[PDB]
Design a protein around this ligand. Structure first.
Ligand SMILES: [Mg+2]
Ligand SMILES: [Mg+2]
Ligand SMILES: [Mg+2]
Ligand SMILES: [Mg+2]
Ligand SMILES: [Mg+2]
Ligand SMILES: [Mg+2]
Ligand SMILES: [Mg+2]
Ligand SMILES: [Mg+2]
Ligand SMILES: [Mg+2]
Ligand SMILES: [Mg+2]
Ligand SMILES: [Mg+2]
Ligand SMILES: [Mg+2]
Ligand SMILES: [Mg+2]
Ligand SMILES: [Mg+2]
Ligand SMILES: [Mg+2]
Ligand SMILES: [Mg+2]
Ligand SMILES: [Mg+2]
Ligand SMILES: [Mg+2]
Ligand SMILES: [Mg+2]
Ligand SMILES: [Mg+2]
Ligand SMILES: [Mg+2]
Ligand SMILES: [Mg+2]
Ligand SMILES: [Mg+2]
Ligand SMILES: [Mg+2]
Lengths: 206, 113, 152, 124, 243, 51
RNA sequence: CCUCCGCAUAAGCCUGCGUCAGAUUAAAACACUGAACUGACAAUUAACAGCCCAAUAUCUACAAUCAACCAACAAGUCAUUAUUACCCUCACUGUCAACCCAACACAGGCAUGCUCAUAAGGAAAGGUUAAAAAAAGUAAAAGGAACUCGGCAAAUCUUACCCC
RNA sequence: GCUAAACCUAGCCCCAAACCCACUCCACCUUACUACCAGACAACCUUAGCCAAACCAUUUACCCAAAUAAAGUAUAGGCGAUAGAAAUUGAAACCUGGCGCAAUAGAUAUAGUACCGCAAGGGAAAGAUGAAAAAUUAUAACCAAGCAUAAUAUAGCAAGGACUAACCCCUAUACCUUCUGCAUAAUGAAUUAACUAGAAAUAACUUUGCAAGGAGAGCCAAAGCUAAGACCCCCGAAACCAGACGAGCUACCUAAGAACAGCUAAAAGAGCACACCCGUCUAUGUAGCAAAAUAGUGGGAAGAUUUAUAGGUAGAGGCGACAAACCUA
């Protein structure tokens, strides 16, 4: 759950909590770290779910969507575009089923595209005076909303069903606390009918 | 395990409940007595010359006649100043080397990018 | 409760009562042979016999007759990569017994592997893999080594 | 040589060391002159377990519960919520006296009642 | 790396920190004064320039002190400006022999005095120079009150000085009623000093004792926040009502 | 006098994408064919225009 | 076949030949798989020895050695009284092992009880031939220390003389 | 081509600036990592020593207040190897790097980890493909010391002259050094890769610049003054002091315990003899089982005997039934 990562750990697509990650770089090799661009959290404009465009590569000028983002090394993948070829099932007597695998790209090679004309355009962070903070274009002045992407919880609230050990909503938001000058221990003692006649004598503290 | 996240969920729920009840107890103590941290104590210097927070153990007999509490010394004595100075110099070297590392990293970032 | 300073009791003071306890018992299945009345638990290092009796008779309300506990010392021989011993966390197992002569066994939480729902992001890949395995494994030793793709 | 990196448990000393070490168990009594233990019933932690019959609250919350902002519960909020209305009520009429404040919950000392806050007489 | 302040300024830094900075100004000045004592074990030079023989050229001469040792018996009793000299002495007063070590010890005479300001007799192992200074100062109280802290070289002397200063400042009844003329004459005899009360309590105290006294004066149990809260509440309601 | 051999790897591709992850695989084909076409038996005999 | 051994107590790191998968590589002086291993499963529950004793004043010279004759000298290993107060009671440490100290799985060393050989426990030999040399064991036609500075392993069983 | 060779980053040293920090709950002075009970005694002290003067007994910068000239001047000094001021003009606040390096270098450090002793303490190598290891692909190979591919073929410090061809023909006594004389049978060496050993003043030499003046205050000068270049090794002992540690093996002492079959028992610091304490001799090995072993021939074995537990006596000393014996091989 909470494992301490090495100070110079290499992020290679696979999450740190996996068998392939422990097989790749086990805690014994301290290879050369890869210095990445020091990008802050407020300037990160591209998210996960919006459409992007590959600048250059084996298939430049093509569109696609992002399914996973990496903030440690600025690695982003495209939904089945700049991909190669490998094999999934591999044994000692038979192997096949060639399934393409995506390749990560950098932020300098990925530009956000506006859905109005489907053209590459640099997007800046212009703080709106209404209250929220969205993304505003530069040469076009257009606004690009945040793409709706499912959270990591793996469950949507539009069809959630309360189980046996799941409470409702009308009881969790019921105002039942009464502010007073009584401790919880004495309150739960006097509420159950527990009484006490003797007191506590004098004691020192040193 | 079928669902290991339920354990962590219950753990964080109980931790939040403990934090809430501790905050309530601290607020009530400040409204009544007005002193933070229900564990009493004072800043005392040990033999090693380290400024630590000594916690009271709550005894029965007082301290002016106890046999085991009187054997617990609380004075620096002029022979630990050199060790404290050496520890300060070591920590200063650590901080200077950390600052040098940060400056080298900044220079590498400005040179490559 | 554990990791909590207990108040010093004076001769004639009030009853020491705890509300929100900080104990976590674990019902572990016995490894060796045990009778039908002896139940094995696992209490933390800061728990005695009367405390376990009160914890079992206050919450679960289980009639406990006798409690016999002992300390278990974890292993300490496993070496890492830099030649260093790995210390395992210790625990204290219990051996409580029922009072009214009742019986208790340890059921299994596992023999129920009858699950086959709709799988699109997991079962589809396995179905494609098994279909490819069934369609590809068709070698012919009479060919010698020529590929079976050219229809000529 | 013997071990040094390992901690001092209760399986290292001879016959004269097994006993006074222990595993940090809380004592509930003392000894006498006949190798006996005098257990006091007022020293064992008594677990107070309330009834759970008519209690309609599950340990897990539903996902349909709306979220809200988080803020610490300081002493000023509790004061302004509890003592402020009573003080305003007794002052708006004409009977407030700054000499006595024991009728609002304030205690000048902690040696009067049982459950003291600063010395903490209760366990947990 | 290097340090910002020298090694002989850390005491001043700690005094200017926080807990040691709340001390009064007169006490800090008396502690940082540091004045050389009077020559005891060596005859000081007359003028700053001395004409040495063999050559008719003037040269500047200086009187250096003698590193003497102060045992706790000196701090307990009332000694003069002497003590233990841990020096070295040659054989037959010649440098072409053997350099031996010799430690001189002062003479101790267990006598008995009588202080007029305190009206109580004390048994002090007095020496000879102290008796000579007492006879020259015309009494013991004058010798205690006139000599500064760098002349007593003892804690009992500073304690007696502080006690006499407090007795002369507070105007507390020394003896007893039914005869105030004696107390009036005693107070009039010692009138050329009269150190105020706020400055006489910090005379002769060490650093640790001064820190302890400052902590005891600045103790103050934490006032409950309920009083401050109700005070702010009543102030706010008065401000919103009177307007 | 206390060294062993490292390099512990396997030559087999197991399952690891869908084991606790939020990124699926965007394929570009399928397994086999949808329905097997059945040519006529007299295809070689009637290889002309029509009949 | 040996038992000049073993079982317990005392001292000692505490999990160190139970199961499962790997046994492709890695430590067995070679193999099976396991006293020179990786991860998971849990052993040992006290009644055994400890964890000890409310004070004020006072009291305790005729040993042990079957202790009954006798006999001593190194003159000795064990005990209570009056008063005050105290009727809550069974908590804690370990119960595994083929194990310790000597760099080791070493022909070295370790305190007491038990049958002084038994109901404890183990194998001098991997196979092939009988080279020379060396070490450990039985005896030999005649002499029994005649070889060696000296009775130097050895078995018979051995008296007298001198110095210290 | 196997063994195996290179792939840069944790950062490492000193400057300028800045003064740098220490409780989330529990445990930490007794057997620290221990919740709970009745003598409160615990610091205030010339450091020494090595070396040098060819020994050494006086002496020998180290002393913690910013530069320099005075000045290494008066002075102190077995008046000698050396040490060394003062009086005096004076001393321009603020700026983020390496004509240093990249794992045998640079802190020892990924670390004060393993390991050694009861103890203080000593204390070492580590990590290399790649944009995509969620690309287990097919390549990039080629160089040192060791090997097969591909053993020897008579003769000779391994070498030279040579011819149509390796030998066959002739000549020829390895390397640095203390030494007159060394391959000598004197010293060192198995190779490869990394590392390791001439650092500097007064007085001298040469070349610019200025000049009876030179020189960025101070110093020199009857052709001088300033600046630059040029120059003087490494490793290897027994000894002494200061601050801390050891009687768990061994010497002695203290308190409570245990051990000794059987026979003759003359009453015994009696005898033979089990277990036990020590080891006079033979044989085996001296990189062995063992940095002190294996059987008997051995002495004692009711006491000047042995042993389990706990404490004390430590170097200008402890102890000693006196071996200069022992004080953790
Ligand atoms: Mg057992
Ligand atoms: Mg050995
Ligand atoms: Mg058997
Ligand atoms: Mg053989
Ligand atoms: Mg014969
Ligand atoms: Mg002969
Ligand atoms: Mg013989
Ligand atoms: Mg010399
Ligand atoms: Mg000057
Ligand atoms: Mg290094
Ligand atoms: Mg190193
Ligand atoms: Mg080669
Ligand atoms: Mg020839
Ligand atoms: Mg050479
Ligand atoms: Mg030589
Ligand atoms: Mg010669
Ligand atoms: Mg030679
Ligand atoms: Mg020679
Ligand atoms: Mg040689
Ligand atoms: Mg001893
Ligand atoms: Mg002896
Ligand atoms: Mg005898
Ligand atoms: Mg005998
Ligand atoms: Mg002799």
């Amino acid at each position: 759950s909470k494992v301490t990562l090495p100070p110079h750990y290499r992020y290679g697509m696979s999450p740190p909590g996996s068998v392939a990650d422990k097989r790749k770089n086990p805690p014994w090799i301290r290879r050369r770290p890869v210095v990445v661009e020091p990008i802050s959290d407020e300037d990160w404009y591209l998210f996960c779910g919006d459409t992007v465009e590959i600048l250059e590569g084996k298939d430049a000028g093509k569109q696609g969507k992002v399914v996973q983002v990496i903030r440690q090394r600025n690695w982003v993948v495209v939904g089945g575009l700049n991909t190669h070829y490998r094999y999934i099932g591999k044994t000692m007597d038979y192997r096949g089923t060639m399934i393409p695998s995506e390749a990560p790209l950098l932020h300098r090679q990925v530009k956000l595209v506006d859905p109005m004309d489907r053209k590459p355009t640099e997007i800046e962070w212009r703080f709106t005076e209404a209250g929220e903070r969205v993304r505003v274009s530069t040469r076009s002045g257009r606004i690009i909303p945040k793409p709706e992407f499912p959270r990591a919880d793996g469950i949507v609230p539009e069809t959630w069903i309360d189980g046996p050990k799941d409470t409702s909503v009308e009881d969790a938001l019921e105002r039942t606390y009464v502010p007073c000058l009584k401790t919880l221990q004495e309150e739960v003692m006097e509420a159950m009918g527990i009484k006490e006649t003797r007191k506590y004598k004098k004691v020192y503290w040193y | 395990m079928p669902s290991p996240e339920r354990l962590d969920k219950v753990v964080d729920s109980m931790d939040a409940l403990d934090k809430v009840v501790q905050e309530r107890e601290d607020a009530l103590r400040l409204l009544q007595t007005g002193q933070e941290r229900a564990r009493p104590g004072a800043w005392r210097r040990d033999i090693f010359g380290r400024i630590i927070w000594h916690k009271f153990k709550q005894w029965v007999i007082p301290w002016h006649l106890n046999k085991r509490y009187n054997r617990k010394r609380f004075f620096a004595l002029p022979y630990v100043d050199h060790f404290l100075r050496l520890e300060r110099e070591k920590r200063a070297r650590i901080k200077a080397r950390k600052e040098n590392l940060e400056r080298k990293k900044a220079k590498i970032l400005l040179k490559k990018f | 409760a554990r990791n909590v300073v207990y108040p010093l009791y004076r001769l004639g003071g009030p009853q020491l009562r705890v509300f929100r306890t900080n104990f976590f018992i674990q019902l572990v299945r016995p490894g060796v042979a045990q009778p039908e009345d002896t139940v094995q638990f696992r209490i933390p290092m800061e728990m005695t016999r009367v405390d376990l009796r009160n914890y079992l008779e206050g919450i679960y309300n289980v009639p406990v007759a006798a409690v016999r506990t002992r300390v278990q010392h974890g292993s300490n021989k496993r070496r890492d990569h830099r030649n260093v011993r790995i210390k395992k966390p210790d625990y204290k197992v219990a051996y409580v017994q029922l009072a009214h002569g009742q019986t208790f066994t340890f059921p299994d939480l596992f023999p129920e592997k009858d699950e086959s729902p709709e799988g699109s992001a997991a079962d589809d890949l396995y179905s494609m893999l098994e279909e490819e395995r069934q369609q590809r494994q068709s070698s012919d030793p009479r060919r010698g080594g020529v590929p079976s793709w050219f229809g000529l | 040589g013997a071990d040094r990196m390992s901690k001092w448990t209760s399986k290292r000393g001879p016959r004269s060391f097994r006993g006074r070490k222990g595993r940090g168990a809380k004592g509930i009594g003392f000894l006498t002159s006949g190798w006996r233990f005098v257990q006091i019933k007022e020293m064992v932690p008594e677990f107070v377990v309330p009834d759970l019959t008519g209690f309609k609250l599950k340990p897990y919350v539903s996902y349909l519960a709306p979220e809200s902002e988080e803020t610490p519960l300081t002493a000023a909020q509790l004061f302004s919520e509890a003592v402020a209305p009573a003080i305003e009520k007794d002052f708006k009429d004409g009977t407030f006296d700054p000499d006595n404040l024991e009728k609002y919950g304030f205690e000048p000392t902690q040696e009067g009642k049982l459950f003291q806050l600063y010395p903490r007489n209760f366990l947990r | 790396p290097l340090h910002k302040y020298p090694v002989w300024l850390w005491k001043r830094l700690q005094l200017r920190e926080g807990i040691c900075s709340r001390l009064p100004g007169h006490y800090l000045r008396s502690l940082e004064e540091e004045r050389t004592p009077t020559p005891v074990h060596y005859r000081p030079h007359g003028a700053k320039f001395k004409i040495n023989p063999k050559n008719g050229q003037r040269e500047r001469v200086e009187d250096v002190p003698i590193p003497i040792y102060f045992p706790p018996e000196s701090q307990r009793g009332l000694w003069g400006g002497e003590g233990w000299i841990l020096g070295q002495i040659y054989a037959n007063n010649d440098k072409l022999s053997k350099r031996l070590k010799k430690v001189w010890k002062p003479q101790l005479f267990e006598r008995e005095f009588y202080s007029e300001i305190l009206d109580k007799k004390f048994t002090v192992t007095v020496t000879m120079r102290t008796l000579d200074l007492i006879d020259e100062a015309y009494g013991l109280d004058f010798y205690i009150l006139k000599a500064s802290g760098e002349d007593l070289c003892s804690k009992f002397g500073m304690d007696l000085k502080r006690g006499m200063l407090l007795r002369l400042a507070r105007q507390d009844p020394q003896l007893h009623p039914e005869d105030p003329e004696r107390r009036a004459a005693i107070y009039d005899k010692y009138k050329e000093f009269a150190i105020p009360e706020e400055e006489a309590e910090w005379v002769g105290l060490t650093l640790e004792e001064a820190i302890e006294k400052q902590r005891l004066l600045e103790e103050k149990d934490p006032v409950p926040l309920f009083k401050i809260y109700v005070a702010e509440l009543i102030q706010q309601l008065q401000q919103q009502a009177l307007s | 006098t206390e060294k062993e051999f490292m390099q512990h790897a396997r030559k087999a591709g197991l399952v690891i994408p869908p084991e606790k992850s939020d990124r699926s695989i965007h394929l570009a084909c399928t397994a086999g064919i949808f329905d097997a076409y059945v040519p006529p038996e007299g295809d070689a005999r009637i290889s002309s225009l029509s009949k």
